[PDB]
């Protein structure tokens, strides 16, 4: 069984995209008309008032503010969700801060205002209304499929996907944030999100879990050339009996995913992905620091990593900031003590930079013996720069310092080696100087 729509062409429930265990009850798409997907423009020149275009007639194009000069990213919400006067429209309104771009939300809230196996299937529909769009800029302005991003959230990254399958893989580039797990994780690449379906694809996972048992919406499964888990990727920072899932695709850690994208438009390197098979390495510090070519960044600017498609499924870990921007800049502190007695009390340390210093952060907790050394990694939600000097902090009687503080830069590996010869009482801001 299946429908034809016109010229978006023909949908069936043959498997994989129906009629199987992931996706047992055979489902049809609803009418383009049902769905009822919107092109929304934005501009530098029109940032907040969007316009309204349509592939079906390009003329709508001329007449907006689209520039064929400027480069071309697609934003795609998930489900019940949409794009006015929400987080799509207002990640436009970040970019335009920073570059000059057309800027175009895909609305489809009434198609994802269902129950979601229809979802799943009316997906495809807007994913050909995407392409359809899309194959209207080459073939009437010839404007070139390198110069297009399709950015999509949860269902969007999959709708993204199709698109992609729709246009042979050679949209410029694929962006799928904590792309939808229900109905994806372990199906067939026609179904969903891979590495093939753009030239460059890279996936931000923050909700992951398998399906078995579900602890979230995201797809723990790696989709891209490059793949990010954030904090892990289960459980973001800031975020027995009847388990209940009934509103788990408006998880705060399921939405965070957008949240450090529209963030890193800003904040270019705030998300560095160190390179790491599991998060326990990351949090272990095997996977540090940045390779010598240099750390991805993760959201925005992932496009400027060098061979950022040499390969599929590279994994990245990082650390993000709990609130606000989101920020954070990986360090390993290196502590090496010294006293004439050993005291059970805590370490603390201090950042002091060019740009401005950083808070006190706990290195070690219980026995403190003179000439100990102690390793531990911190996150810093702002980056410091040149580190000037440190700071050295400890409390429970008698005199304690340390003797040498080595802080390595996440970033560009740069190490620093600071000294002193002093000890000092408990609560005493110690400081070390360069050596
Ligand atoms: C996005 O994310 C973060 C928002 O949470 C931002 O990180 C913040 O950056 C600032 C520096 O830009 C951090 O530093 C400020 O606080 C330190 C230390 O504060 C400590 O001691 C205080 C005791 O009074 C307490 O109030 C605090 O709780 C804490 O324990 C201060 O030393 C600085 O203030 C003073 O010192 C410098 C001199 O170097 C002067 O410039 C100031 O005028 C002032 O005299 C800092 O203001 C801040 O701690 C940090 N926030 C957190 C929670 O980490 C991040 O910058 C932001 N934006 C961007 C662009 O990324
Ligand atoms: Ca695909
Ligand atoms: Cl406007
Ligand atoms: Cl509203």
Redesign the pocket.
Known sequence: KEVCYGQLGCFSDEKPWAGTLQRPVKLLPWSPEDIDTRFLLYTNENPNNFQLITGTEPDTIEASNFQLDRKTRFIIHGFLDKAEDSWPSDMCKKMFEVEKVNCICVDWRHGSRAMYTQAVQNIRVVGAETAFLIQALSTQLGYSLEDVHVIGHSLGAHTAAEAGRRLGGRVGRITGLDPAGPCFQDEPEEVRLDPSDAVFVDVIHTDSSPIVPSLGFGMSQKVGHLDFFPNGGKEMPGCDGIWEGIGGFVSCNHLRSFEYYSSSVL?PD?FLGYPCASYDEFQESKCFPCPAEGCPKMGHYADQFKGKTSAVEQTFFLNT?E???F?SWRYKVSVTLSGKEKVNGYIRIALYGS??????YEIFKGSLKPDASHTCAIDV??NVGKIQKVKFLWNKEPKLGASQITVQSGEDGTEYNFCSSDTVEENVLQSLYPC
């Open positions: 904040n705030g900031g609130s606000g921007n920020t740009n401005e210093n950083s808070k006190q939600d702002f």
